[PDB]
Every structure is written in structure tokens, then in C-alpha cells.
Amino acid sequence: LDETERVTLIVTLGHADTARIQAAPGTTAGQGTQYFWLSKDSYDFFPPLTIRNRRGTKATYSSLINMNYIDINYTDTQCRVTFEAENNFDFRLGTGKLRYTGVAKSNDIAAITRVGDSDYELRIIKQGTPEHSQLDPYAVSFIGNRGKRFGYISNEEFGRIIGVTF
DNA sequence: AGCACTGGGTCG
DNA sequence: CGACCCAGTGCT
Fold this sequence. Notes:
This is Restriction endonuclease. The chain is mainly β. The protein contains 3 helices and 10 strands. It has a single domain (about 1-165), classed as At1g16640 B3 domain. Strands 1, 2, 3, 4, 5, 6, 7, 8, 9 and 10 form a 10-stranded mixed β-sheet that branches. The longest helix is centred in the N-terminal third of the chain and has 8 residues, at about 15-20.
């Protein structure tokens, strides 16, 4: 991992991003697969999307990564990031371990730090926190029609803002 | 049980 | 019709 690529993806979370995280067990709201929807341009932040869809007629190009859910102390070696190429151009980051946990809601900030070629750490930056205030401006790029914002920050400065050594 | 799939929505 | 948004179904 080149020094230039040791960065953190900051993205403002929406409703669909946290619908299953906030939902109660057995609710329709808490049904389905839990993702964070990212920008399609962020694929260069991830390993080569080479893993193909087994079933299905439409093409999906996926990659498996080690995601370190920091807020729940869990490293999922099977965190799938998928580009729905022939469907709706969704770029999804699997976050199923946060289901029914309620650690994130709308306008919270997801911080995805790249610490290796295939190694990542996921932190939820709750709204109302100084960290959220200092991280929010780094999300300059507007995506979606619901006002999602994303951007990148050096692991250094992010580490300073949240008080963590990388 | 829970995620790989499905397939609409909406805005420009 | 490109690019996120959203709510599931059904297969493993």
C-alpha cells in the first residue's frame, strides 16, 4: 500500500445506510442485506473487483476485504464490497455486523480507514461530537439526491482528530 | 438466519 | 440512463 493510498474514506450516512442498523428484530425495516452505499468512483479505494456473481443473470463485480468494525471489536474477513454493474450501478460496502446494533443513524459519519491492501477499519462518528465537526468538512464531494457527501483524509490527520495511531 | 441477489424509485 | 436511494425476496 503506497503512502499516497493510506487514506480514510469519510462519508455522511443516510436512511437506507442505517435502516437495518436502527431497526428492531423481526421488523421489515430490519430485513435484507445491510450496506453503506458508496460512490461508484471510490472503487479505486478497494481491491480489484474480480469476484463474480455465482447465481443471477446480471453481472456483479465484488471484492472481499478484512473489515475491522472498531465500535464492536470485530474483524470480518468476509466483508464484501460489490458493484452492481449490470443492475443499477450501486456501489455497496457490506456492513452486516452493525445490524440491530443501533450504533449509527442518519447524518452520522462513517469513517473507513485503509490500513492495508485488503485491510480496513470502520468507525462510526456520531453527530454532535467534536470529531464529527472536524471530519464533516472533509466530505466535499456530493453524491445522491438525498445530499450524501464523501471525501478522503490522510490517515495522519484523521488519527490526530480521533486520537489514534496508525 | 442472514446475506447474495432482485428490482423497483428518484432526480437531473 | 447514470448514479445513489430504498425495501425487500429467496437461496444457502
